[PDB]
Write a protein that binds this ligand. Structure first.
Ligand SMILES: O=P(O)(OC[C@@H](O)CO)OC[C@@H](O)CO
Length: 311
């Protein structure tokens, strides 16, 4: 048995997302004795964002690695999973992805032709990156902030008080340099990995408005033709790779902040409650969502927090 798969994502070689995909692909190749050959293609040189997910839906020999908002048009519950200001830590989100609730969402994705291998390639809390000290939604008035091109991001930055400007990453950094947008948003790992800090935007507001994470998607039609012994290896290696990425970035974050600070980046806290109030209206069911999905998510998060507090 032989299968070759093209894996596409938008990240740069210096970023851990890219390094993790390479490591997992190599591990799977080795552990399957060459039977499963996943080749990686960084920096959106192949179809990416929704175009990558489209290849998956259309049954290509393809793995798309994108945040869950990019499967939300096909499986609307994933819009709720990627809602803003839900998660307080990487661990909360990992825990939620292991819940029966999220397993049910994965089953919904399979019915739409999308096999989800992971949801928790976490690349960090996304923060505002601008030339200003932003503390409240009022501070964002008139500021054009680049976001990725999905409704989740557009709605989030709009509700936060900005002029959301949805653009692929490739159209972003020069746009920031030229003032076509006033800033952007992303994790400290994105900031350092793509050298956002070498540009004019060296103020980071710790809004943590979205927990940036990639899922890993493959067509059910392709998946179902893979012998079970190789399915298990592919699945185990993607799960292990996510765990490693999450633990690594958790470890690195303090150092990354210090290194960014050494390059002149200045971090500030925000009025969290003010941003939470601005965003609360976004927790509304959209067509195709499971009735009560937000309430179900909140119930899980509340329970894990309650148990943590107790112990
Ligand atoms: O802000 P984006 O377009 O986030 C997209 C990511 O969520 C994948 O779907 O890119 C993040 C960077 O780290 C890419 O180099």
């Amino acid at each position: 048995y032989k299968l070759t798969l093209k894996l596409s994502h938008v990240f740069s070689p210096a970023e851990q997302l890219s390094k993790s995909m390479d490591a997992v692909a190599e591990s799977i190749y080795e552990k399957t004795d060459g039977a499963i050959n996943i080749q990686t293609f960084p920096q959106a040189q192949l179809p990416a964002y929704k175009e990558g997910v489209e290849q998956v839906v259309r049954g290509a020999k393809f793995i798309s690695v994108e945040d869950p908002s990019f499967i939300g048009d096909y499986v609307p519950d994933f819009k709720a999973l990627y809602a803003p200001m839900l998660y307080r830590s990487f661990d909360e989100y990992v825990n939620l992805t292991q819940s029966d609730l999220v397993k049910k969402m994965q089953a919904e994705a399979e019915k739409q032709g999308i096999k989800i291998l992971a949801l928790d390639y976490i690349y960090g809390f996304r923060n505002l990156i601008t030339q200003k000290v932003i503390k409240t939604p009022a501070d964002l008035k008139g500021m054009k902030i680049r976001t990725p091109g999905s409704k989740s991001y557009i709605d989030t930055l709009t509700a936060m008080g900005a002029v959301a400007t949805p653009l692929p990453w490739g159209e972003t950094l020069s746009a920031v340099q030229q003032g076509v947008v006033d800033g952007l948003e992303g994790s400290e790992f994105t900031n350092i990995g793509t050298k956002v800090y070498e540009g004019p935007t060296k103020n980071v507001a710790n809004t943590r408005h979205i927990l940036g994470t990639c899922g890993v998607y493959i067509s059910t039609k392709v998946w179902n033709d893979i012998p079970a012994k190789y399915q298990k290896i592919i699945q185990d290696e993607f799960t292990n790779g996510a765990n490693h990425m999450v633990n690594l970035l958790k470890s690195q974050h303090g150092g990354v902040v210090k290194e960014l600070e050494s390059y002149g980046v200045k971090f500030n806290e925000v009025d969290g409650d003010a941003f939470r109030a601005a965003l609360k209206p976004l927790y509304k069911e959209q067509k195709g969502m499971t009735p009560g999905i937000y309430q179900s998510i909140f119930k899980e998060l509340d329970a894990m927090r309650a148990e943590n507090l107790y112990f």
